[PDB]
Amino acid sequence: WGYDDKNGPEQWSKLYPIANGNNQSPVDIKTSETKHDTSLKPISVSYNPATAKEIINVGHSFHVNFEDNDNRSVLKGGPFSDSYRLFQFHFHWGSTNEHGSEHTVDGVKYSAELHVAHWNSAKYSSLAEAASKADGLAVIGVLMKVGEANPKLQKVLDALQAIKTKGKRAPFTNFDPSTLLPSSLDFWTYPGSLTHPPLYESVTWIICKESISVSSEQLAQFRSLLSNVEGDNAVPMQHNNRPTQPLKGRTVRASF
Numbered sequence: 001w002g003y004d005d006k007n008g009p010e011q012w013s014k015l016y017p018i019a020n021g022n023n024q025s026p027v028d029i030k031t032s033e034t035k036h037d038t039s040l041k042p043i044s045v046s047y048n049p050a051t052a053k054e055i056i057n058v059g060h061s062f063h064v065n066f067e068d069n070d071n072r073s074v075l076k077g078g079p080f081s082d083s084y085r086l087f088q089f090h091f092h093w094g095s096t097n098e099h100g101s102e103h104t105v106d107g108v109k110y111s112a113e114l115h116v117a118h119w120n121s122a123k124y125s126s127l128a129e130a131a132s133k134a135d136g137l138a139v140i141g142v143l144m145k146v147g148e149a150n151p152k153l154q155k156v157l158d159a160l161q162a163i164k165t166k167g168k169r170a171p172f173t174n175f176d177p178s179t180l181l182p183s184s185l186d187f188w189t190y191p192g193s194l195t196h197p198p199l200y201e202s203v204t205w206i207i208c209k210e211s212i213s214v215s216s217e218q219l220a221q222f223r224s225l226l227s228n229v230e231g232d233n234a235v236p237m238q239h240n241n242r243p244t245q246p247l248k249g250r251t252v253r254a255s256f
């Protein structure tokens with residue numbers, strides 16, 4: 001699976017027919033159609049930098065994975081009664097600065113998007129159990145607007161040189177990804193899906209109102225990762241953002 005013409009978002013529905021389901025992600029958030037929900041509590045994140053484990057080139061992207069054997073690193077609040085356990089963060093980007101976010105806001109496309117992913121450790125005992133459950137996953141999305149270089153990305157960007165080709169992996173330790181979140185945690189929430197196969201409709205999306213910055217040159221560092229395995233002809237990871245999907249009657253709630 002990838003973002004090419006023959007393995008990309010338009011091809012996913014042949015093995016994953018949920019791609020055409022009613023709770024698919026990402027979406028365009030129309031702010032005139034959001035419903036302010038008074039019952040939404042503030043997002044609370046409390047992550048232990050010691051849970052940072054590994055950075056991996058997965059061919060179409062890179063993932064930073066976390067130790068998830070215990071509740072050292074948790075998300076609570078917002079729409080949730082259950083505590084969610086941090087397990088990964090990653091980014092999405094586009095071929096040029098003009099697009100690359102997954103979510104849009106009032107049709108506006110940003111240059112990239114951060115995803116911070118968690119699984120419901122109150123109700124389930126593993127990511128594998130949680131992955132397919134309607135209440136199983138919680139992902140914070142942060143829209144990334146091209147502009148000033150973001151110094152909080154530095155450890156992540158410095159690590160990429162050790163995972164240049166598909167399947168390379170390296171230790172990635174002592175990192176608290178709450179340092180990447182915007183200063184305001186005002187958010188939108190809706191019920192949706194993984195944005196990559198297998199596209200399970202198991203994700204409660206938390207989309208931050210406030211963007212964070214990224215430079216043109218930092219985006220170029222993402223696009224210079226290689227989708228090929230070592231020794232093959234180099235094939236840059238140009239883009240990995242899924243198009244926005246129909247809301248199909250879902251309501252986006254606003255904390256603000």
Ligand SMILES: NS(=O)(=O)c1cc(-c2nnn[nH]2)c(NCc2cccs2)cc1Cl
Nearest residue numbers: 058115117131137139193194195196198
């Ligand atoms: N983009 S996203 O909706 O945040 C997302 C994307 C992926 C992905 N992207 N590439 N490969 N996997 C993912 N992988 C881990 C899994 C969890 C459960 C089953 S597989 C988890 C999340 Cl939440």
Ligand SMILES: [Zn+2]
Nearest residue numbers: 090092115195
């Ligand atoms: Zn993602």
